[model samples]
Target: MGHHHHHHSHMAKPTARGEAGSRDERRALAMKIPFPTDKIVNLPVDDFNELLARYPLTESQLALVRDIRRRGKNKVAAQNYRKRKLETIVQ
Candidate 1:
């Protein structure tokens, strides 16, 4: 049979390699979020809440920021957990 369009040949699709920025970064920019993506991902819990308080976010922006934070925390937790698990198994 002849070839067909690849799964990624659409505006919403990402290319095979890395794109310009992480999804969260791009989403934040598109939503015109008030704060830096870095702060959204890495601020300490108390300060993170406080930092967000200063922003005049709509419900959607606030939701996106929380989701970004949740994913960031989960990613770090998964990495640390996997590393320790591997080390224990090998040693």
Candidate 2:
């Protein structure tokens, strides 16, 4: 008799914040966003505005784009703050 070996990768799970990003991505897809969600959120303001100009998006589409960018930036800010807080407290 031989025993089967079981292995687990223990990879990271997508947290709530990750789920929020996907939620926005799904919403963008349903609305036919002209670009990918990453570009929508990560482009510079000038580039973002230029990208916006390239598309003839409706008012609501534009609103969601802006909201996505806002939330994405806020998430980055929160992540940095949390890391800094942890470092300060742990040190």
Candidate 3:
């Protein structure tokens, strides 16, 4: 359990350039967004929309943000759908 718990820290998060992240992350990198993928994936729509205004992102980075948000939402939706499916079967 000690070994398992050791990896649960914030430092354990994967790099976007590596195999540990999603295709969207790699695509974002390729698009030259230069922003944190987690922020793109998880920020609330209102917050995300306001984020780039602090510095101004180009059209390229803007598209990646939108894509990442959409992809992350779909991912969560799929997980929720599967969980509900399993619960229904269980019941």
Candidate 4:
């Protein structure tokens, strides 16, 4: 007779400091994506102003814009899928 055993390996969780540092690094990388601030050749200034007025965004709103831009560039559909899976598991 032979005995068999199965062992599972778990991934280590990042410490709070480690998580914060990672977030800071990611934010720095995200910030490096250049926004077309200085050049608006074809875009009309009045139209831009009207769009801005309609949105009424603050500095914090810029974060969402940057995040969306980063996600688009990085092909982050997987991230959204994973997030939804985690949410479903929690519920």
Runs in model 4 with CA error above 4 Å?
A: 1-54, 76-91
Query: Which candidate achieves the best lDDT against the true structure?
Result: 2
The Cα local distance difference test for each model comes to: 0.80, 0.81, 0.72, 0.46
Q: After superposition, how far is residue 34 of candidate 2 from its true place, in Å?
A: 1.5
Model 1 regions lying over 4 Å from their true place: 1-20, 80-91
Q: Which regions of candidate 2 are displaced past 4 Å? A: 1-21, 79-91
User: How many collisions between residues are there in candidate 4?
Assistant: 0
- Give the number of colliding residue pairs in candidate 3: 0
> Model 1: which ten-residue window has the lowest total lDDT?
82-91
| RMSD of candidates 1 onward, in order | 12.4, 15.6, 16.6, 20.5
In model 1, how large is the Cα lDDT of residue 8?
A: 53
TM-scores of all candidate predictions against the true structure: 0.60, 0.60, 0.56, 0.24
Against the true structure, candidate 2 reaches a TM-score of 0.60
Estimate the lDDT of model 3.
0.72
Clash-forming residue pairs, model 1: none
Better of 1 and 4 by TM-score: 1
Query: Could you give me the TM-score of model 4 versus the true structure?
Result: 0.24
